[PDB]
Amino acid sequence: GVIKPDMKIKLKMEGNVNGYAFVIEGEGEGKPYDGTNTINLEVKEGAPLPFSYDILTTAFNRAFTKYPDDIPNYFKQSFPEGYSWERTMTFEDKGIVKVKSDISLEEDSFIYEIYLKGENFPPNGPVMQKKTTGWDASTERMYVRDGVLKGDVKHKLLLEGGGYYRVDFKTIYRAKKAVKLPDYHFVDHRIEELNHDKDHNKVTVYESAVARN
């Protein structure tokens, strides 16, 4: 099919957080059937970013998910036409991020066109004060609503000094063709900043994702 065991990634994100504008380009690769992906990110406008890089990482593609044979794969079935997604991240201190991404396929490269807007983050909270220490492992509840796939996460951003900062994810995934719809299932995630430079001008993100009943 069009989804090969090794695939590349190209992305551009236009972002605005608490009114601060920025542009990020990424290049990476992954193993769609293994459910693993790596993206190398460079800030092109707005360096040094004046907020926590953790609020962007989950924006930088469920095509990279390991799926048991018996659970229909909403994402892989969508290609070559691909799919788009829109997401609201609601933070326990009333900060909010809204993301949309178009996922297309050019030969053996996924292409992501991302728009991100964050607002109402407390100026002295851990996002704007860069006091976050990465995402916990998560489980995303995947379920069909109105003919498209919804993903819900009760997520946690770890904090410097210990404990965590609650974030609810609601995502809507919209295939650009008729696909066999899965029953309700789970996707377990682990996302990691593998490395970065002093101001997160250059960041490498890794994610693994596996579907189970």
Short mmCIF file of N, CA, C and O in Angstrom, two decimals, residues 34-37 62 64 188-191 206-210:
data_model
loop_
_atom_site.label_atom_id
_atom_site.label_comp_id
_atom_site.label_asym_id
_atom_site.label_seq_id
_atom_site.Cartn_x
_atom_site.Cartn_y
_atom_site.Cartn_z
N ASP A 34 5.12 -0.01 13.47
CA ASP A 34 5.72 -0.12 14.83
C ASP A 34 5.06 0.89 15.77
O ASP A 34 5.17 0.72 16.99
N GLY A 35 4.44 1.92 15.22
CA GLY A 35 3.90 3.01 16.05
C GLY A 35 4.99 3.86 16.69
O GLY A 35 4.83 4.25 17.86
N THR A 36 6.05 4.21 15.96
CA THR A 36 7.14 5.08 16.48
C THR A 36 7.46 6.21 15.50
O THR A 36 7.36 5.99 14.28
N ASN A 37 7.82 7.38 16.01
CA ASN A 37 8.13 8.52 15.11
C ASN A 37 9.08 9.48 15.83
O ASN A 37 9.02 9.59 17.06
N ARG A 62 -1.41 10.06 13.98
CA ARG A 62 -1.81 8.71 14.43
C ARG A 62 -1.61 7.67 13.32
O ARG A 62 -1.88 6.50 13.59
N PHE A 64 1.21 6.94 12.71
CA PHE A 64 2.28 6.24 13.46
C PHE A 64 1.67 5.66 14.73
O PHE A 64 1.89 6.18 15.83
N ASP A 188 -2.35 3.95 23.76
CA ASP A 188 -1.33 4.28 24.79
C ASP A 188 -0.20 5.03 24.10
O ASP A 188 0.30 4.53 23.07
N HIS A 189 0.18 6.17 24.67
CA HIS A 189 1.22 7.06 24.12
C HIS A 189 2.38 7.18 25.10
O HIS A 189 2.14 7.13 26.32
N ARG A 190 3.57 7.40 24.55
CA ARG A 190 4.68 7.96 25.33
C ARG A 190 5.43 8.94 24.43
O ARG A 190 5.94 8.51 23.39
N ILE A 191 5.44 10.21 24.83
CA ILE A 191 6.13 11.29 24.08
C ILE A 191 7.25 11.86 24.94
O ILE A 191 7.09 11.98 26.16
N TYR A 206 10.32 12.43 20.23
CA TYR A 206 10.01 11.01 19.96
C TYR A 206 8.65 10.67 20.56
O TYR A 206 8.34 11.08 21.69
N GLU A 207 7.88 9.85 19.84
CA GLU A 207 6.59 9.31 20.33
C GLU A 207 6.44 7.88 19.87
O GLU A 207 6.83 7.54 18.72
N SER A 208 5.91 7.06 20.77
CA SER A 208 5.44 5.69 20.48
C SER A 208 3.95 5.64 20.83
O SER A 208 3.54 6.37 21.77
N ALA A 209 3.17 4.85 20.09
CA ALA A 209 1.70 4.79 20.25
C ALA A 209 1.22 3.40 19.86
O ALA A 209 1.58 2.96 18.75
N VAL A 210 0.46 2.74 20.73
CA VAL A 210 -0.02 1.37 20.47
C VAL A 210 -1.50 1.32 20.80
O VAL A 210 -1.90 1.82 21.87
#
